[PDB]
Design an enzyme around this catalytic site. Sequence first.
Site, short mmCIF file in Angstrom:
data_model
loop_
_atom_site.label_atom_id
_atom_site.label_comp_id
_atom_site.label_asym_id
_atom_site.label_seq_id
_atom_site.Cartn_x
_atom_site.Cartn_y
_atom_site.Cartn_z
CG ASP A 1 25.34 85.59 10.99
OD1 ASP A 1 25.06 86.71 10.34
OD2 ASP A 1 24.65 84.62 10.53
CG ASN B 1 20.63 84.92 13.44
OD1 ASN B 1 19.92 84.10 13.00
ND2 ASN B 1 22.33 85.05 13.11
CE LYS C 1 21.67 86.24 9.76
NZ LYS C 1 21.02 85.16 8.68
C1 LIG Z 1 18.22 83.22 10.28
C2 LIG Z 1 19.01 81.84 10.78
N1 LIG Z 1 20.41 81.95 11.21
C3 LIG Z 1 18.06 81.18 11.81
C4 LIG Z 1 17.63 82.29 12.84
C5 LIG Z 1 17.02 81.37 13.95
C6 LIG Z 1 15.84 80.83 13.51
C7 LIG Z 1 15.30 79.91 14.89
O1 LIG Z 1 16.08 79.16 15.32
N2 LIG Z 1 13.96 80.25 15.08
C8 LIG Z 1 13.07 80.22 16.10
C9 LIG Z 1 13.53 79.32 17.39
C10 LIG Z 1 12.67 79.32 18.37
N3 LIG Z 1 11.55 79.82 18.19
C11 LIG Z 1 10.91 80.33 17.11
C12 LIG Z 1 11.78 80.62 16.00
C13 LIG Z 1 15.90 79.96 12.44
C14 LIG Z 1 16.82 80.36 11.24
#
Ligand SMILES: C[C@@H](N)[C@H]1CC[C@H](C(=O)Nc2ccncc2)CC1
Lengths: 383, 383
Positions: A190, A195, A192
């Site tokens: 996945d 991510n 993208k």
């Molecule tokens: C699009 C989804 N597969 C998912 C992508 C990663 C996102 C995240 O963990 N965000 C994040 C982590 C740490 N710091 C900032 C944002 C949340 C939603």
Amino acid sequence: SRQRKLEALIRDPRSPINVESLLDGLNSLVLDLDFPALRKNKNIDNFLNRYEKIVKKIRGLQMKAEDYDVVKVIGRGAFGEVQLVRHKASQKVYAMKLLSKFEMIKRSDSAFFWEERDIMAFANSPWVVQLFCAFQDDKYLYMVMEYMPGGDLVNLMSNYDVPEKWAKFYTAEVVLALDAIHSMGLIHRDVKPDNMLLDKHGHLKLADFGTCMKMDETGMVHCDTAVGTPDYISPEVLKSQGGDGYYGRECDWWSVGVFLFEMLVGDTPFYADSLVGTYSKIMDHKNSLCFPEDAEISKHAKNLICAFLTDREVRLGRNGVEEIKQHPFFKNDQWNWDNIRETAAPVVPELSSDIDSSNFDDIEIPKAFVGNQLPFIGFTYYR
Amino acid sequence: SRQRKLEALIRDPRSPINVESLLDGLNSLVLDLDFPALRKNKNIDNFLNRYEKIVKKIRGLQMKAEDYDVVKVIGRGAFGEVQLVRHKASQKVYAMKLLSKFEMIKRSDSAFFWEERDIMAFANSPWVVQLFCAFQDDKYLYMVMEYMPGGDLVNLMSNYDVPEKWAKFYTAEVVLALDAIHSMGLIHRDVKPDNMLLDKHGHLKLADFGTCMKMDETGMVHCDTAVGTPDYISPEVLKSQGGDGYYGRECDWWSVGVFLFEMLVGDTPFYADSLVGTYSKIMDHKNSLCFPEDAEISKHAKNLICAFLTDREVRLGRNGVEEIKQHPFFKNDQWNWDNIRETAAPVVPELSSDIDSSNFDDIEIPKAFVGNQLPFIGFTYYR
Ligand SMILES: C[C@@H](N)[C@H]1CC[C@H](C(=O)Nc2ccncc2)CC1
Ligand SMILES: C[C@@H](N)[C@H]1CC[C@H](C(=O)Nc2ccncc2)CC1
């Protein structure tokens, strides 16, 4: 002794029956049993009135949503939620993910938090957002992870004209992160921009893993569900949807190609209005793919994109990552394959506080013994 | 920290959620779930196939029947069994009790192993047979306890003419043991020669507890079942059978009286052919009790017996054990109330090996989630 051998496993944080397991164990059993309905059963009642008291003291002592303050929601959607949080006691700042248990299983057949957990818990890799602790309650999984103040690649691309000098960098970083995951026996499936997050210094990590999968001793996986974002799926995965899916890691390299293209051209190479239009185009890639005449790309940047967007049988990286690493497109002056994460990131975040979130957008009973907490046992993870 | 506070309870062998609890917990849950029948349920199947492997390695590492050799069965009957066993690794010799789980709950509503366990585990009293470890399997509870090579009082009485000099001794020892239990907040309720064993030096301990009960802040218990051996039951307990039973510790002193009488006279004071005959006589004690003219007893030995065999309202020891301790019958020369267990026992066992057992006789699926192992959780006990 036999006796030490035991205490080994109960402590080993990688053991399926470390303390948290068991405490999850006992704890879920309470929940899945405590209803006037089955409390009718002799055993079930007695049991519950016994542990009753102690379990409350425990529930209080363990990790709790309450241990944190919500600075603000920085990501919501079809998943659950990400919040900027402050550990009350340590005064320190983390990102916390909230997952609906309800969703998690019942709907999602293919969002293995298991895989995700272990990766962020134990990858111990500069390429992988890190998990400091996990806990549940009746409704939710919670993941406490490093705040990535840089925002995602979607956001980045959304804000700049990415020159190739830049693109080289992000692509390379992605490739390294992917090879990390791979060489841990996993396919990501996945890839993208959503991510891919950026840390404080503007370097990249991979932040979602809900779709990864251990490979064959042959490096392959057998699969029958398609997974990922329409725009980025590989043909093989798209096809796997029809039963008899069999493919390797090179499907992750497909998505990289898309990513590059999207980064260089500012549109995804298989855009349509329908998803099927999209799918159509993806299967039709041999004819559907090409570059707008006003797009300013190097020939090398085109070969590479094209080397990626083709059928597994011929696609770049079926012979492993080295031939990728070796593509002319990557020749550059700021870094090599070994130092890159030490070099200067092309976009450096300027963060005025430890809760500056400028890179993100504002957001807007049973009958039978059913046993719903079972799959969440052993999720809680500490240190 | 909150975090240490936890590890406290998990280790505390008196905590209801120490490691064994949890491991019992997880372990029983397997058993009570592993049937083609409910494995149909989604959760239940997944779960079981997960822990599957690990639980087997555990089952192997823990305490097992197999860790011991059966020297021979030294007591069987309506309960389960006692065997002389040799700890294979330590080469050492113990007595092990086997309890039918099947029986244990389903039939017995009033055989609280719980009480028994804790007493032998934690009385830490020279008056109480001691429990070195407890474990279960699917069918059984197992209790590993000090081998009492002397045999029981039934056996003793069965073999000798007990002079009063002797009787003084055993009675005193019983009184001390009882007061032990009492002052631990418990009523024994099943004082019979069969529950009194002799150690290597021929001194007494109490060996069964399945019927004990925490007292009121007033020293009383509320009860509606009669418990004990017909021959030895007190009127109040006999009556409790009719609902609205309310009585104190002095019911244990009743049985002592019987015991004395039986020891001095070589018959129990309320013998009949029916149990009801017996009961009849017990209720009729004021007229039913008396001494054969050929029985050779002191007047003091008679007062004391009579002081015991009467209605709680007047019975000796309703004012506590001191008035008992003070009865003339006890005046003697070999011991006082403080040294007795140090003095010379009247019958000294001569045991030629550490497995000499000369003082004993030779012996001769569900539909619903039912949850039968629940009540056995937290029974396993170690060290
Ligand atoms: C699009 C989804 N597969 C998912 C992508 C990663 C996102 C995240 O963990 N965000 C994040 C982590 C740490 N710091 C900032 C944002 C949340 C939603
Ligand atoms: C009569 C029942 N309430 C019960 C009395 C105690 C006995 C026992 O534990 N026996 C024992 C223990 C240690 N060493 C020898 C015998 C088993 C049966």
